[PDB]
Amino acid sequence: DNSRYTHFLTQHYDAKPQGRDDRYCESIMRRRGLTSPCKDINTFIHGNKRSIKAICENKNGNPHRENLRISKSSFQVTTCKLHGGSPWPPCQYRATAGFRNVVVACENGLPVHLDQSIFRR
Ligand SMILES: [N]
Ligand SMILES: [Pt+2]
Numbered sequence: 404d405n406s407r408y409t410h411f412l413t414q415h416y417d418a419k420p421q422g423r424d425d426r427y428c429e430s431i432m433r434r435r436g437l438t439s440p441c442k443d444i445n446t447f448i449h450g451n452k453r454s455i456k457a458i459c460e461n462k463n464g465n466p467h468r469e470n471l472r473i474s475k476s477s478f479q480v481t482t483c484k485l486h487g488g489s490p491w492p493p494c495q496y497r498a499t500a501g502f503r504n505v506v507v508a509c510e511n512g513l514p515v516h517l518d519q520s521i522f523r524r
Pocket of ligand 1: 411414515516517
C-alpha cells in the first residue's frame with residue numbers, strides 16, 4: 404500500500420503553482436477536496452517529488468521530536484489560512500508563500516503526514 408503517500412501528495416504537494424496568491428489557495432483547496440468542511444490551514448510543497456521522499460532517509464532528513472522528520476533542504480511552500488468565519492464553502496483563503504525546511508512523518512520510506520505547526524506562526 405502507498406495510499407497514505409498519494410493522499411499526502413493530493414493534500415500537500417503542488418509541483419509548480421505559477422502564482423501563489425489568495426485565488427490560487429481558493430482554487431487548489433477546492434481541486435484537492437479540502438473544502439467540505441473548510442480546512443483551517445493547509446500547506447503545499449513545490450518542486451521535485453524525488454527530494455520530498457528523500458526526507459525519509461538520512462540523505463535529506465534528521466529525526467524530529469517523537470515520531471517525525473525535518474528536511475535538510477529548504478522547499479518553496481504556500482500556506483493557505485481560512486478568513487472568517489464559516490467551516491463550510493465558500494472557503495476564502497489567504498496565501499503566504501514561504502521557503503524553508505519541512506517536517507513530515509515517514510513510513511516505508513515515504514512521507515504520509517505534514518506537521519502544520521511550523522507554518523501556523
Ligand atoms: N498530513
Ligand atoms: Pt496527516
